Amino acid sequence: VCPPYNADFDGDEMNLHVPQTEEAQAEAKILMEVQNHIISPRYGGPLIAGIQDHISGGYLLTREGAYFTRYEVEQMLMFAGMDVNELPEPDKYENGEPLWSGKTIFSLLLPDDLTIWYRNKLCDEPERCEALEKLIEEKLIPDPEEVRKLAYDGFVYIQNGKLLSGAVDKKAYGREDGKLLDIIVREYGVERARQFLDQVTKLTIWVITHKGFTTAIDDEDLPQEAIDRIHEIIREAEEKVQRLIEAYKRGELEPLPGKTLEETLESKIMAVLAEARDNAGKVAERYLGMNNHAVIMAKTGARGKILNITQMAAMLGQQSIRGKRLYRGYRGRVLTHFKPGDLGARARGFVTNSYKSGLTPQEYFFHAMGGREGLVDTAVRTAQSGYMQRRLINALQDLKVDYDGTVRDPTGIIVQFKYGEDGVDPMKSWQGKTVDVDRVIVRTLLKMRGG
Partner 1 sequence: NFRIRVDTRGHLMHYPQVPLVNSRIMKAVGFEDRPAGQNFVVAVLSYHG
Partner 2 sequence: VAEKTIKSMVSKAELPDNIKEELYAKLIEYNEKYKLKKDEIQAIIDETVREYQKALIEPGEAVGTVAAQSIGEPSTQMTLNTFHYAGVAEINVTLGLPRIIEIVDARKNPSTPIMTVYLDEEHRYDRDKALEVARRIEGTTLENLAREETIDILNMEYVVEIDPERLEKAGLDMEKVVRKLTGSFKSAEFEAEGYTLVVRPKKVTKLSDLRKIAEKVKKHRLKGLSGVGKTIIRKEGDEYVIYTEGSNFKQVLKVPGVDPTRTRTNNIWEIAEVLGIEAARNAIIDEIVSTMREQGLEVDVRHIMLVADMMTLDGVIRPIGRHGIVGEKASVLARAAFEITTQHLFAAAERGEVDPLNGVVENVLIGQPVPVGTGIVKLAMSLPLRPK
Partner 3 sequence: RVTSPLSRDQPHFEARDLHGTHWGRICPTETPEGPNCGLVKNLALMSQI
List residues binding partner 2 (CB under 8 A). Answer: 27, 41-44, 138, 256-258, 270-271, 274, 320, 322-323, 377, 381-382, 384-385, 388-389, 391-403, 405, 407, 410-411, 413, 415-416, 419-421, 423-426, 428-429, 432, 434-438, 440-441, 444-445, 448-449
Please give the backbone phi and psi of residue 333, each rounded to the nearest 5 degrees, phi first.
-165, 170
Task: Count residues near partner 1 (CB under 8 A).
Answer: 9
| Binding flag, residue 294, partner 1 (CB under 8 A) | no
- Number of Cβ within 10 Å of residue 217's Cβ equals 7
| The entry of partner 2, partner 1, partner 3, none that residue 213 binds, CB within 5 to 8 Å by partner kind | partner 1
- Is 53 annotated to bind ligand? no
Angle of helix 70-77 relative to helix 191-211, nearest 10 degrees, comes to 140
- What minimum distance in Å lies between the beta carbon of 14 and partner 1? 20
**Alpha carbon distance 427, 420 (integer Å):** 13
Determine if residue 198 is labeled as part of a ligand binding site. no
Q: Which is nearer to Mg ion, 12 or 373 (CB)?
A: 12
User: With CB under 5 A as the contact rule, which of the stretches 6-14, 144-152, 320-328, 397-405 interacts with Mg ion?
Assistant: 6-14
Binding of partner 1 by 214 (CB under 8 A): yes
Least spacing, CB of residue 220 vs partner 1, in Å: 14
8 is in an annotated binding site: yes
Nearer to partner 2, 58 or 317 (CB): 317
Work out what residue 391 binds among partner 1, partner 2, Mg ion, none; the CB cut-off runs from 5 to 8 Å by kind. Answer: partner 2
For the beta sheet containing 155-158, the strands, ordered from the edge strand earlier in sequence to the opposite edge, are 116-119, 155-158, 163-165
Q: Contact, 82 vs 144, CB < 8 A?
A: no
* Residue among 104 and 429 whose Cβ is closer to partner 2: 429
Q: Which of 176, 184, 83, 82 is nearest to 121 (CA)?
A: 176
Half-sphere exposure of 414 (CA within 13 A, CB side): 8
Q: Helices 191-211 and 52-61 sit at what angle, rounded to 10 degrees?
A: 70
Compute the CA torsion angle 82, 87, 91, 92 (nearest 10 deg).
-80
Residue 2 sits in the site that holds Mg ion (CB under 5 A): no
Q: For residue 338, which of 300, 316, 366, 376 has the smallest C-alpha distance?
A: 366
Specify the 3-state DSSP secondary structure of 164.
strand
- Burial letters for 323-347: b for 16+ Cβ neighbours within 10 Å, e otherwise? eebbeeeeeeebeeebeeeeeebeb
Q: What crossing angle do the helices spanning 261-287 and 224-249 adopt, rounded to 10°?
A: 170
Query: Site residues (CB under 8 A) for partner 3?
Result: 321-322, 328-330, 334-336, 365, 368-369, 372, 375-376, 379-380, 383
Which of the choices Mg ion, partner 1, partner 3, none does residue 379 contact, using the CB cut-off of 5 to 8 A by kind?
partner 3
12, 27, 275, 422: residue in contact with Mg ion (rule CB under 5 A): 12
Residue 303 CB, shortest distance to Mg ion, in Å, is 16
Of the candidate spans 8-16, 165-173, 311-319, 430-438, the one that interacts with Mg ion by CB under 5 A turns out to be 8-16
With contact defined as beta carbons under 8 Å apart, do 1 and 48 qualify?
Answer: yes
Shortest spacing between CB 332 and partner 2, in angstroms: 24
Task: Compose the 33-62 pattern: x for residues touching partner 1 by CB under 8 A, - for all others.
Answer: --------------------x---------
Q: Is 329:353 a contact under the CB 8 Å cutoff?
A: no
Q: What is the secondary structure of 53-93 as a DSSP string?
A: HHHHHHHHHTSSS--EEHHHHHHHHSSSS----S-----SB
Nearer residue to Mg ion within complex by CB, 12 or 133? 12
Sequence ranges of the binding site for Mg(2+)? 8, 10, 12
Q: Binding residues for partner 1, per CB under 8 A?
A: 53, 205, 208-209, 212-216
